[PDB]
Write a protein that holds these residues in place. Structure first.
Motif, PDB file in Angstrom:
ATOM      1  N   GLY A 284       5.260  -3.300   6.593  1.00  0.00           N
ATOM      2  CA  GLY A 284       3.939  -2.778   7.028  1.00  0.00           C
ATOM      3  C   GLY A 284       4.029  -2.183   8.406  1.00  0.00           C
ATOM      4  O   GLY A 284       5.031  -2.382   9.111  1.00  0.00           O
ATOM      5  N   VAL A 285       2.968  -1.494   8.796  1.00  0.00           N
ATOM      6  CA  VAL A 285       2.844  -0.924  10.133  1.00  0.00           C
ATOM      7  C   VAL A 285       1.398  -1.313  10.648  1.00  0.00           C
ATOM      8  O   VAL A 285       0.529  -1.574   9.833  1.00  0.00           O
ATOM      9  CB  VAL A 285       3.051   0.537   9.950  1.00  0.00           C
TER      10      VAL A 285
ATOM     11  N   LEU B   3       7.961   1.176  10.434  1.00  0.00           N
ATOM     12  CA  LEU B   3       7.329   2.290  11.111  1.00  0.00           C
ATOM     13  C   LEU B   3       7.138   3.547  10.442  1.00  0.00           C
ATOM     14  O   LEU B   3       6.164   4.233  10.704  1.00  0.00           O
ATOM     15  CB  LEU B   3       8.046   2.553  12.435  1.00  0.00           C
ATOM     16  N   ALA B   4       8.092   3.913   9.548  1.00  0.00           N
ATOM     17  CA  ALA B   4       7.952   5.122   8.775  1.00  0.00           C
ATOM     18  C   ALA B   4       6.800   5.135   7.779  1.00  0.00           C
ATOM     19  O   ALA B   4       6.405   6.189   7.370  1.00  0.00           O
ATOM     20  CB  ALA B   4       9.249   5.355   7.981  1.00  0.00           C
ATOM     21  N   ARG B   5       6.187   3.997   7.482  1.00  0.00           N
ATOM     22  CA  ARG B   5       4.962   3.979   6.734  1.00  0.00           C
ATOM     23  C   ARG B   5       3.842   4.749   7.478  1.00  0.00           C
ATOM     24  O   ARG B   5       2.849   5.073   6.871  1.00  0.00           O
ATOM     25  CB  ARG B   5       4.509   2.497   6.526  1.00  0.00           C
ATOM     26  N   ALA B   6       4.025   5.144   8.739  1.00  0.00           N
ATOM     27  CA  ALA B   6       2.826   5.552   9.628  1.00  0.00           C
ATOM     28  C   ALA B   6       2.306   6.852   9.091  1.00  0.00           C
ATOM     29  O   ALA B   6       1.126   7.152   9.091  1.00  0.00           O
ATOM     30  CB  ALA B   6       3.241   5.742  11.091  1.00  0.00           C
ATOM     31  N   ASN B   7       3.189   7.684   8.509  1.00  0.00           N
ATOM     32  CA  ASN B   7       2.714   8.924   8.043  1.00  0.00           C
ATOM     33  C   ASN B   7       3.009   9.156   6.567  1.00  0.00           C
ATOM     34  O   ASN B   7       2.942  10.238   6.170  1.00  0.00           O
ATOM     35  CB  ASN B   7       3.388  10.134   8.734  1.00  0.00           C
ATOM     36  N   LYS B   8       3.146   8.110   5.808  1.00  0.00           N
ATOM     37  CA  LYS B   8       3.092   8.095   4.353  1.00  0.00           C
ATOM     38  C   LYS B   8       1.710   7.939   3.753  1.00  0.00           C
ATOM     39  O   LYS B   8       0.891   7.080   4.312  1.00  0.00           O
ATOM     40  CB  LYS B   8       4.000   6.944   3.896  1.00  0.00           C
ATOM     41  N   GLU B   9       1.478   8.627   2.628  1.00  0.00           N
ATOM     42  CA  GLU B   9       0.179   8.556   1.938  1.00  0.00           C
ATOM     43  C   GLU B   9       0.097   7.408   0.950  1.00  0.00           C
ATOM     44  O   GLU B   9       1.003   7.208   0.224  1.00  0.00           O
ATOM     45  CB  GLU B   9      -0.145   9.842   1.180  1.00  0.00           C
ATOM     46  N   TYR B  10      -1.028   6.644   0.968  1.00  0.00           N
ATOM     47  CA  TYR B  10      -1.268   5.569   0.025  1.00  0.00           C
ATOM     48  C   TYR B  10      -2.735   5.630  -0.442  1.00  0.00           C
ATOM     49  O   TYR B  10      -3.535   6.395   0.124  1.00  0.00           O
ATOM     50  CB  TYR B  10      -1.067   4.270   0.694  1.00  0.00           C
ATOM     51  N   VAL B  11      -3.153   4.879  -1.457  1.00  0.00           N
ATOM     52  CA  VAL B  11      -4.510   5.107  -1.893  1.00  0.00           C
ATOM     53  C   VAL B  11      -5.300   4.325  -0.803  1.00  0.00           C
ATOM     54  O   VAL B  11      -4.764   3.412  -0.249  1.00  0.00           O
ATOM     55  CB  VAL B  11      -4.781   4.548  -3.294  1.00  0.00           C
TER      56      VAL B  11
END
Length: 244
Positions: free
Chosen positions: A22-23, A39-47
């Motif tokens: 998580g971030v 950290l790379a979750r910061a600019n990934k799309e999720y619902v």
């Protein structure tokens, strides 16, 4: 004072202890700070999952699909949780995260108007597809953790394109905690009907001096994990950083 390295290590550990990835993004004035173990979750799309209730409430109130005291009646059918089998206002439903009440509100707004307002506000990828009653749960609407903390920052400061009164009514729906003169306003989110599952706690702290610090936590939820881990990591992170 405490080093960056140490804050980062501590908050990353909160996520590591929960055996999740998580971030959490914090925003101070214009500056975004990203913390956590992935950290790379910061600019990934999720619902957005129930995150989207903040905006569905704005759209419904602005468009006169409901008022803040309207009681949405339970229709009597069995619901995923007993606590949802009751009559409730949009605010009660925000707190209980009662998806059926907010699916009724979506259906009153209707596909065409919902797609226009979601575009107007520029939320996430802005795409709601053809199903008015589940697009924020299973796609195709998606939003990155950055766009969420930016959404909370706009709401918090009354910068979304809705009447001031609409925004204030929705923010009153979101007070989830007081801790030492600080008020925490947030909405949680758990998309269970997507793989991997996505967990969210997006909001802002209002400090006693009136300053607002927006945040979005975003993590992978796993079968048998408890929902209060979103809260626990969030409060530990904010307190580690001295925000609360």
């Amino acid at each position: 004072h405490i080093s960056s390295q140490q804050h980062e290590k501590a908050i990353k550990s909160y996520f590591d202890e929960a055996q999740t990835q998580g971030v959490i993004i914090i925003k101070e004035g214009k500056n975004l700070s990203t913390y956590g173990n992935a950290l790379a979750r910061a600019n990934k799309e999720y619902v957005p999952a129930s995150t989207f209730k903040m905006l569905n409430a704005l759209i419904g109130l602005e468009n006169h699909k409901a008022t803040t005291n309207e009681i949405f009646k339970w229709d009597g059918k069995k619901r995923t949780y007993p606590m949802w089998e009751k009559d409730m206002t949009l605010g009660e439903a925000m707190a209980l995260s009662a998806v059926p009440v907010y699916q009724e509100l979506a259906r009153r707004t209707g596909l065409e108007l919902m797609q226009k307002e979601v575009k107007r506000v520029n939320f996430g990828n802005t795409n709601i597809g053809t199903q008015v009653d589940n697009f924020w749960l299973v796609g195709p609407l998606k939003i990155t953790p950055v766009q969420e903390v930016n959404f909370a920052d706009d709401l918090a400061h009354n910068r979304l394109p809705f009447k001031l009164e609409t925004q204030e009514e929705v923010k009153k729906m979101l007070l989830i905690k007081e801790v030492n003169g600080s008020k925490i306003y947030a909405k949680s989110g758990w998309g269970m009907g997507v793989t991997p599952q996505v967990g969210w706690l997006t909001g802002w702290v209002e400090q006693a001096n009136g300053k607002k610090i927006p945040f979005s936590l975003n993590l992978e939820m796993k079968e048998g994990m408890s929902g209060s881990i979103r809260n626990e990591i969030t409060y530990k992170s904010l307190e580690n950083l001295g925000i609360i």
